[PDB]
């Protein structure tokens, strides 16, 4: 039940495709920051899930570079999908910005997304 | 310059190509946890850095399944890519494991890798 | 308006006391892990925030050992007060367990919750 | 073994006593960004910890505030006190920074730090 289009709490677009194999593939597009328009993701998921009531990990990153812009960083995004009624990814990211080694100490942000099915 | 053999503090296998389009496919080798043999890695990176002192802001996933064992989880690495003769890759992780949503609040893992390319 | 009885998502009371100087103390409960009833927390915060919409930064630390138990652990959280008609602390957190050097790479959790002043 | 001074990779000073209660207090002048002098810090750590190999798990706040610089934030260290000949203090950090709503998704820098005490 992954694939398909979600938004986030702050109006990303992620739109995904889940492959039979484990593959996470599709486009990501953010509301806020220095991006616009989209941008090439790619990740992995667990596509044999635990029998119990558990979750399905999955991840994915995002180089922010496209025809447009290049901001200098990319995002990954950790967390686990949540089937039922009212479905819903819960995440987990850090977002890294190329800088000098003097400046190492303040390249990564992190945060927390989580995505439905409702725009 | 990314493309290549890498190894972390752990003693883990990092062996990665970097695509002209901005992408990142290889294999990953941990040499702790539930886990065995290779997996499959897929990410991203910034193809067009800036050309000044800056590091080259990449991440990829791993999901931890493959034909011989599953632990379901996800790691995802975010970080930079520093050239020159001692190449490195500093990291800072996610790993993410499904369960209940009675025990989300501890399914996510966070830490640091550096990876040092061989020769 | 920090000084006062918050909850958050999972149900644990956090108890503090915001000094004139930008000090924190209180007691802390989880609803959820090995912990039972009150621990100790002590903190800071910005006594003299930003004029403009911005919240009031903030942080605490509990180590998770009272009179009935020690789970040799501790939490950080770090996040910003925001005021309002329905005030609220958003905080990213951070859990440190004991742990051998050779399970060192595994001995943080990392996590957000959400505090509001309603039980 | 806690008690003393200790030094981190970035330069920065960080003076602490341990109380038999298990609190942590002292000051902490940071090397890098946009602070100068000396910060007060309070935090708690494992009073009773395991007789084992393990660390001792610990964690500390400093709001960067005082009587002659504010940066509005404050950040908290969360880790693990490894004694003996080398007594180091393995950390990782959130830095939160107050900012308005609109900016909230990027107000926490997230990062490590490894601590060497000094004779
Ligand atoms: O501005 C920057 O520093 C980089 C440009 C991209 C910023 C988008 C970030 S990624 C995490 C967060 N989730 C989301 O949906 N948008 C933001
Ligand atoms: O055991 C588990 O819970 C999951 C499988 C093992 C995960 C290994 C982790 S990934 C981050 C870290 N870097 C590395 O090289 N090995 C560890
Ligand atoms: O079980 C453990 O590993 C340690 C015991 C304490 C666990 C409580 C954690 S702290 C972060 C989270 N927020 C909250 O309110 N409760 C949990
Ligand atoms: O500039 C700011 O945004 C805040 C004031 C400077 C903060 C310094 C940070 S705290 C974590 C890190 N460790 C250290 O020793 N110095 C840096």
Redesign the interface.
């Known amino acids: 039940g992954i694939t398909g289009t979600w938004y986030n709490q ?1 109006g990303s677009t992620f739109i995904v495709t889940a492959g039979a194999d ?3 593939t599709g486009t990501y597009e953010s509301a ?2 220095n991006a616009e328009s989209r941008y ?11 029998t ?14 496209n025809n447009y812009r ?1 901001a ?9 999908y ?1 089937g039922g009624a009212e479905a819903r990814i ?12 003097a400046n ?9 997304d989580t995505f439905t099915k409702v725009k």
């Open positions: 702050l484990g593959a996470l806020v920051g090439v993701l790619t990740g992995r998921y667990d596509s044999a899930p635990a119990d009531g558990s979750g399905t990990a999955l991840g994915w990153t995002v180089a922010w570079k290049n200098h960083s990319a995002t990954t995004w950790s967390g686990q949540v819960n995440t987990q990211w850090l977002l890294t910005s190329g800088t000098t080694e190492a100490w303040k390249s990564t942000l992190v945060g927390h």
